[PDB]
Amino acid sequence: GSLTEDGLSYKEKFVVRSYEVGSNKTATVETIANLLQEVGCNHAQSVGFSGFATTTTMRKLHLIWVTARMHIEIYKYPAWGDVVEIETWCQSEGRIGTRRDWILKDSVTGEVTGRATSKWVMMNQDTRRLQKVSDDVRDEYLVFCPQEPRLAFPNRSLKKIPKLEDPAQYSMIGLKPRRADLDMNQHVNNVTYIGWVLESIPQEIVDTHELQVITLDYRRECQQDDVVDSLTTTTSDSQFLHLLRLSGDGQEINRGTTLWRKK
Numbered sequence: 340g341s342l343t344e345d346g347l348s349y350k351e352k353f354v355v356r357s358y359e360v361g362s363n364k365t366a367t368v369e370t371i372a373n374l375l376q377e378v379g380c381n382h383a384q385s386v387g388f389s390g391f392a393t394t395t396t397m398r399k400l401h402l403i404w405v406t407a408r409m410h411i412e413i414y415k416y417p418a419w420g421d422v423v424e425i426e427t428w429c430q431s432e433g434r435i436g437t438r439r440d441w442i443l444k445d446s447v448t449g450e451v452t453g454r455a456t457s458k459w460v461m462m463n464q465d466t467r468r469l470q471k472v473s474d475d476v477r478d479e480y481l482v483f484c485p486q487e488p489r490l491a492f493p494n495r496s497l498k499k500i501p502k503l504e505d506p507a508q509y510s511m512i513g514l515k516p517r518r519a520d521l522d523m524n525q526h527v528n529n530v531t532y533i534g535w536v537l538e539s540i541p542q543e544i545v546d547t548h549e550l551q552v553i554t555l556d557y558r559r560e561c562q563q564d565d566v567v568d569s570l571t572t573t574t575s576d577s578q579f580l581h582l583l584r585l586s587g588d589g590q591e592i593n594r595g596t597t598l599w600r601k602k
């Protein structure tokens with residue numbers, strides 16, 4: 340891929356690979372989330388960042404970007420073989436943090452086959468303590484963002500997610516991350532959590548429906564040595580509320596909604 344003409348967004352294409360697709364020979368949503376991360380990481384490279392996207396000042400202060408929310412809407416999943424073009428860019432949301440967005444297109448048709456957004460926040464790597472953004476860093480990244488609004492989602496991506504009340508309708512328990520689920524920093528990839536959420540979706544559903552939407556608030560990181568319970572309940576198309584929590588204490592690590600359409 341590369342930066343667009345104006346250097347305020349990044350474009351890249353991906354060929355969907357054998358092991359990337361689900362049972363209907365189209366890309367799994369995990370494959371997608373992976374591709375957003377990947378193009379995101381190249382956008383950050385192309386402009387001289389680190390996958391924490393750190394600046395000089397940030398590295399100095401031990402600060403990091405971390406995802407607070409991740410929101411994906413898919414209209415059509417690409418097929419094994421198909422080429423998908425993904426464009427991505429960031430904007431600031433003042434001192435709250437930044438937003439990254441992606442547009443997914445068919446490289447053939449040029450039609451929008453999906454879109455994503457995400458909320459990133461500034462955090463002390465060591466203390467896990469969030470801080471608001473100083474003006475000095477709000478000067479380092481701004482030159483890589485458009486100043487005029489550009490919204491993938493101009494609203495479902497912004498609705499507030501409630502906490503699932505016991506008993507949950509479905510559940511998958513005793514999930515734990517293996518080494519493939521850890522990143523280059525030995526942190527559980529944010530894609531893993533997506534995978535875990537959807538373990539408590541009944542197979543019946545996965546077979547009759549395509550996933551349309553997924554929203555996901557991140558609350559706590561799952562450690563290598565932790566174990567997670569995945570809970571789901573129907574709130575209805577078909578809709579679900581979700582909760583990931585520590586198997587033992589019941590400490591929450593994620594919450595999220597899905598939306599599925601008949602085929």
Ligand SMILES: CC(=O)N1CCSc2ccccc2C1
Pocket residue numbers: 379382383386388392404429430437438439459480483484
């Ligand atoms: C959220 C995020 O991706 N970043 C922080 C906010 S700006 C930015 C702009 C271009 C490339 C990479 C970044 C890193």
